[PDB]
Amino acid sequence: LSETKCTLKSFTVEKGIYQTSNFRVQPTESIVRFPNITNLCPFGEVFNATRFASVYAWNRKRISNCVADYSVLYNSASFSTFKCYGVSPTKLNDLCFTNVYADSFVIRGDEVRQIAPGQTGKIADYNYKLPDDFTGCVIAWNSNNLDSKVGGNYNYLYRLFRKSNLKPFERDISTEIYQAGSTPCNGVEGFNCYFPLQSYGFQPTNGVGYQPYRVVVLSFELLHAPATVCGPKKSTNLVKNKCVNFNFNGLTGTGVLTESNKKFLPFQQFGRDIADTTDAVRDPQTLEILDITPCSFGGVSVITPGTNTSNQVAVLYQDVNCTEVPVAIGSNVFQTRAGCLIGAEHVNNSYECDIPIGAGICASYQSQSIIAYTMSLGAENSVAYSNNSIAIPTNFTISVTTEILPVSMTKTSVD
Amino acid sequence: RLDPPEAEVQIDRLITGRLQSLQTYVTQQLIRAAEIRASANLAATKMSECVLGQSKRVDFCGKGYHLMSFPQSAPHGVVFLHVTYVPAQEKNFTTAPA
Amino acid sequence: CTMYICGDSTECSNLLLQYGSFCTQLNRALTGIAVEQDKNTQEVFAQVKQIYKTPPIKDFGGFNFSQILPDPSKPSKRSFIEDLLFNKVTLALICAQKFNGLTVLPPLLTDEMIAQYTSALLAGTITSGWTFGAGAALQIPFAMQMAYRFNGIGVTQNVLYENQKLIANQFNSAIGKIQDSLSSTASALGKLQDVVNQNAQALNTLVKQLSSNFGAISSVLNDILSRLDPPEAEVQIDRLITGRLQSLQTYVTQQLIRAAEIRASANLAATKMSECVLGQSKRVDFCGKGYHLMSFPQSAPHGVVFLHVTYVPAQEKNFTTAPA
Amino acid sequence: CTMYICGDSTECSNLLLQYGSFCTQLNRALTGIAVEQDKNTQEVFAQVK
Amino acid sequence: AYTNSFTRGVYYPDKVFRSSVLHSTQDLFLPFFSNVTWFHAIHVTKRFDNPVLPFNDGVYFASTEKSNIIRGWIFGTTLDSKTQSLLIVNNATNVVIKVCEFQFCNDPFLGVYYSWMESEFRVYSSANNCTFEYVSQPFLMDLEGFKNLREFVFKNIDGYFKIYSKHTPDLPQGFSALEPLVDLPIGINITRFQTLLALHRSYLAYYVGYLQPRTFLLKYNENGTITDAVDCALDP
Ligand SMILES: *[C@@H]1O[C@H](CO)[C@@H](O)[C@H](O)[C@H]1NC(C)=O
Ligand SMILES: *[C@@H]1O[C@H](CO)[C@@H](O)[C@H](O)[C@H]1NC(C)=O
Ligand SMILES: *[C@@H]1O[C@H](CO)[C@@H](O)[C@H](O)[C@H]1NC(C)=O
């Protein structure tokens, strides 16, 4: 009752039926039926292999259309460095990754501190640099036993002489003599002329900081475009008679999913009708047909008998069956063709209409209470027609009535 | 609280929101005034036939059989009084064509 | 309003709140075209006080009122002519396009209390004449009521009393061509279909305009939320509110303008019923074409149908006159 | 619509397509009110055979 | 040697389902009743046709034959070692796919000596500096021993190669729709194409068309099948 006073904004309400608000039901179970049909990303071919590359000539590989599951690294891999930028380490299972690239190179033990944006060094100025707007993670671990031998290993190389500083993600695989003085080198090594590329030396008896290391750089974007590297939640296999949030491969919303009778073609995935409305979807993991149905619409109105005479009201839930709506958000439920009355009883006699409802029903105030009855057209009469009878009056009466008509309204002007 | 080349963009939503809310008012007043002009022509006809004469149209001037009528005035309107004739106290008989 | 514009988001309701009160103005206009449509049908039909019935024995002097009176076999207690009009006019994704918050309300008078209103006017104009609309019903035989009416166009009574059989045969043969004219031509009800076509066609553009971006990245209100900066979206979300609000005003204005000729058409049936049924008319070419005798009503989906009975001369000759 | 709004330029014929069906709807009233006028002048005069 | 396709060539543009809806679409289609070019490869003089053709937007390819003589087509920009190419060659054992900078000669073709068995494979000389390959599963196909027809569509948009096909047994007066078959992203520049064939130990049909931007009307079915489609620019 108080809602009506705050809807028409007054302290007194007359007879009638007023529409006040709406009726919605909030979904509870939010699910991501993440379509991780494909196989796992190459987590083995990327992390461990036979041989690696050098600092001056790194490698690039593209990984796409795969499911992200890093849990297989726990039994074997033993890393030594784990730092992430632009994303939380704990949230990586619930997101997607697009345009993911991996780079492989081998650096020195004490030179692993240079793999970070905003650093200076001999690897960060001539061989490999990182951008300022960096979004990813860097992992480094030792490989002393797999990259050492007696007499030293001399297959790893690095650059020592260059004209200026490099740029992020710029590769320089050109080799040439470097002139360190005012005298031209003329392409022949000699005074003030050395080879800009040098070689590394690793031994099994070397110190802690003089042992080889392997570092992998991963870069990706978050939430700007379609992605193909993604992580699973697998909170699938829902209940088929409740309104829940659904997140399919390329759809999002809410509704009720059931089993249908239509047949989707292999080269088709979604469902549509004459109007541009989503009405079907195919399970990418189980290959079945599903439906979508609304659950969260409707409106309610309040019936009042006169605000000072009583404080009793009845409400109507339009176009709602009397099972979903609670009797009070009852022992008095009447089902009609216009909704579901709550708070009024059913009587058998017939009177004239007082407050219309619809479909041939009315309601009126008559201690006292509120009743719902069926309207009656009028009384009943019959005429005794016969082929040789007639009726003629014998008196008369005079009567006077009234009639009202509007003729004009108010004139007005604006500036 | 603003400068000349910066407040111009700020005052271009007030004078575009206060302008759309005027055309709605005028449009709705062009339809209301067309439902009264259809009722000011019915009163004129009902004054030239029920009052200045006698009418044989059924259920036009009152209910029953028309005798006469009287007009009265009211604020922004008019009120009529209709006089009629009604039978009563019937009886039964017997008839024959010829 | 909100279910159509802002969907189910809460980042849109706050922005919509700044536009004043443009929902109680568009909702108080569509509720004025819902009570008038129910007041329209309480003037055409509800003109009788009581409910009359016809006696069992049917001796009307030769006339046969069998194909316009109710029968109990078919339901709703309709007649044999009201049951051929329904099959002609067709009331045709209504099943699930209610996604966006559209509703249809049911009319107050079900189509069973109109068949009980058009079966009393018909049964009270046969056994009473025209006295049941101006007082109390008074009985009279049919063959004398016809003479009463026949005296009103100039011809005397013995003309009718000497040709009863011929007139009865002519009337019986005349009513019965209508059945073949209605049960074979599926285009007679022409102007009762436009009021359905023009109402069900304007409801499709409103839905089909929900997928047109008015100058934004996309027409769905989740791809400008998932991948755009929280400050940047409020610049392009504001580009959709105006677009979806300018298409919700033309619809209301068009409906308001169009629902004003239906009242003009329904103010004519309430006069035709009161003058061509409850009495006899002298106005030329109003209730038919010829000389007026009597009339009968019938019901139809969202409309009414009349039947007029007239008088036409034939077989002229030549003579010679003089004033005095 | 297309000629009144932006002449014959092709830079507007593409920008105008993302406004829905605003100009197909306005090209139907000024054909539904152009036949009623031809029907009106038949009721008054054509009353004889 | 000129003929116009009456109403042939229609491919499913969508990826969704519909039931008895006449929704209209606007995309790239071959115009109705447009003349195309007829090429002949017969031995009475012996006829051997394999020229170089433009690749403006796409080519509606159809091949009518009693025995399989057409294997595949070469693609690229200038067809040398300086630019990459897309190689689709059927070697009578498996489908060969490779994206490399090959080196083609004037007349690369296959052939046999006899019973029937492949005797030559002369396509390319050198191919280096490439990073793509794909090997189809091995299979056996009979040789020797018109009745059949195969239709293809080529499109390269946004670094994606799409192919639609449908096999169904001059050209007849039938009508059918095309469904997607494969989808491979390359992201290269394509401006020309050329076919290769095989010969039966001897020295010395198909039609090539084009498309245009034109909108059609598609009438679906209860089962989501495109039965009939009507153009909107042919006749008034
Ligand atoms: C209060 O309701 C009663 C109904 O019993 C009515 O008679 C009275 O007029 C109402 N009050 C006012 C101030 O109208
Ligand atoms: C009303 O009708 C119902 C069912 O016909 C019956 O159970 C009930 O007793 C009736 N009540 C009265 C007061 O007649
Ligand atoms: C037939 O082909 C010729 C090519 O020489 C072309 O000019 C002509 O337009 C084609 N016919 C039709 C109807 O297009």
Numbering used by the authors:
A (entry chain A): 296 to 624, 639 to 675, 689 to 737
B (entry chain A): 983 to 1080
C (entry chain B): 738 to 829, 849 to 1080
D (entry chain C): 738 to 786
E (entry chain B): 27 to 70, 76 to 145, 151 to 181, 186 to 209, 215 to 249, 264 to 295
Question: What is the paper's account of this structure, in its own sentences?
Answer:
To explore the binding mode of SPC-14 against spike protein, we parallelly prepared cryo-EM grids by incubating the same batch of purified SARS-CoV-2 spike protein with SPC-14 (at a 1:10 molar ratio) or without SPC-14 as a vehicle control on ice for 40 min. For the spike+SPC-14 system, about 48% of the particles were in the closed state (three RBD “down”), and the other 52% of the particles were in the open state with one RBD “up”. On the contrary, for the apo spike system, almost all the particles were in the open state with one RBD “up”, which is consistent with several previously described cryo-EM structures. The cryo-EM structures of the closed state spike+SPC-14 and the apo spike were solved to resolutions of 3.06 and 3.27 Å, respectively. Intriguingly, additional densities located on the three FFA-binding pockets are evident in the closed state spike+SPC-14 map, but not the open state spike+SPC-14 map and the apo spike map.
